[PDB]
Amino acid sequence: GYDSLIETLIKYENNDLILEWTSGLRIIGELDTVFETDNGLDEDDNNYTEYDAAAFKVNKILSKPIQNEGNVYNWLRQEKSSLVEISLYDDPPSTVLLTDGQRVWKSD
Amino acid sequence: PYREVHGFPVKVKPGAQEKHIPNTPNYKQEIANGKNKSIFYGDNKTAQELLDKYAGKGDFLKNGRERVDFGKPIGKYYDRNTGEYVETTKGLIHYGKDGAAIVPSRP
């Protein structure tokens, strides 16, 4: 099956979702699609990694992190697109919440 | 003449695209390795025609990764929750220096 984060986003694909980061970034948005991908490295590279990722449509930034160290916020803050890649491989969130506040996924 | 989108050529990278095309060497090696790749309909010419029309016309989610709703079926997505395939109109174009590939994605 899917990893626990991708599984959660698919389970709640019909929900507005709040994603939080340890950095203090908080966004709200909706799942657009899910796709099989990798980290661009050669298949011979010992760091080559395949993973599933979500395309996530950000409808509002609810909290800006006080530092700019995360890849997700560094993409969003340019405003070239409100779609962003979400995965466990690269700059994972710490929590997924429903809009009633219920925590449906938390990082391990 | 190959156009460019954000510095990447709008040209199929054959080996990368073939990982999603049944009966190709690269597809058959993915399946032998225990993967179940989403299926892209047609061949590398189908992929080049879709790239010509849609590359740069979708929404980027990361440098070198663009989601496109193609408005018609382009393949079948492998649903890991069921182990079966679902027809899809959506794809993620993965760009590189040696060309791009269309990865069918979840509808």
Residue numbers in the entry:
A (entry chain A): 2 to 109
B (entry chain B): 428 to 534
Paper text:
To gain further insights into the function of toxin and the mechanism of toxin neutralization by cognate immunity protein, we determined the crystal structure of the YxiDCTDH528A-YxxD complex at 1.7 Å resolution. We have solved the structure of the active site mutant YxiDCTDH528A in complex with the immunity protein, where highly conserved His528 has been substituted with alanine. The H528A substitution was introduced because His528 is highly conserved across multiple sequence alignments and is probably involved in catalytic activity. There was one copy each of toxin and immunity protein in the asymmetric unit. YxiDCTDH528A structure consists of three α-helices (α1–α3) and three antiparallel β-sheets, consisting of nine β-strands (β1-β2, β3-β6-β7, β4-β5-β8-β9). The crystal structure revealed that YxxD consists of two α-helices (α1 and α2) and one β-sheet, comprising six antiparallel β-strands (β1–β6). The structure revealed that the YxxD binds to the active site of the toxin, consisting of highly positively charged residues and sterically occludes binding of the substrate to neutralize the toxin. Structure reveals that the loop connecting from (Asp33-Asp46) β2 and β3 of YxxD plays a key role in binding to the active site of the toxin. This loop is highly negatively charged, composed predominantly of acidic residues (D/E). While in YxxD, the blocking of the toxin’s active site is mediated by the β2–β3 loop, in NmMafI2, two alpha-helices are involved in the toxin neutralization, highlighting different modes of inhibition in these toxins.
